[PDB]
Structures are given as structure tokens and as C-alpha cells.
Amino acid sequence: YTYGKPFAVMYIPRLGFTWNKPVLEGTGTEVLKKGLGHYANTARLGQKGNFAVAGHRRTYGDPFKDFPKLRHGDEVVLTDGTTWFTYVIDTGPYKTVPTDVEVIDPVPRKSGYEREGRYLTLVTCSHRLIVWAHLDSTQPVEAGKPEALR
DSSP states (O other), rough: BTTTTTEEEEEEOOOOOOTEEEEOOOSSSHHHHSEEEEEETTTOOTTEEEEEEESSSSEEEEEEEEGGOOOOEEEOOOOOOOOSEEEEEEEEEEEOOOOOGGGGGGSOOOGGOOOOOOEEEEOOOOOOOEEEEEEEEEEEEGOOOOGGGO
């Protein structure tokens, strides 16, 4: 993925039917003004590992303003232009310290996962809030939107 450029769009039905945010490569301060940022050392969308994404709560469009509303079972849906990826939240929102970098590792100790999978993590940018999800389904964009976004 090209640094600082959008590569996907995220949808989270819990945060509103019209909530829709670009996901850009990187988590530098300039990237996060434009949208959500993918931690560039973490897995690509859909891949084994942990696809981790940061976003602001109170500045720059406030994409994660209502993060505390997220629940177990809520869907996080992304498109890369070819495939729709539906992730389902298993754990969180969890409050933690900014020093806790472990939360974006491939199998995070605090996620509850005890094995390799295809995970996603959302992070808010002086505590952080975290949710962890796993990949539930995929379908082609050529076939239409997934259930969750109708």
C-alpha cells in the first residue's frame, strides 16, 4: 500500500448507516487528518494477522466520536474495490494506556484470541479505546453490497 494514500473504505453500521470513512496507509499525524490510518507494520486487509487502524475521536471529522457504542457482535465492513470484508467485533471497547503497543500485534494478549486468525483492531488516537474483531465473511464487490450494508 502506498504511504498516505487511501486503499479502502470502512463502514460500521453501529456508528450510522451513512458512516463511511477512507482508510489510508500509515498512522502519522498528516494521514489521520484525512481519514482512518492503517498501522503500516500490520497485516493487510483480510490477511492473517491483525489489520490495525487508528482514528480520531474529537478532531478532524471525529470519525470515532461514538466508539463507546460499539458492542460484541457489531460488524466492521471494508471494501478495497474488489472485495467486501466483514469483520465482527469480539472484544471491547477496552480502555488502555497509549504505551500498550501489544494491542496491535498479530495475536494480542488482551484480545482473548489464543491463536492466529484474520483479525482487525480499531484504536482511538490520554487513554485509548480498543476493539478487536475477526473476519467473518468476504464477497465480491461485483456481486453487490453485503447483508450488513443494505
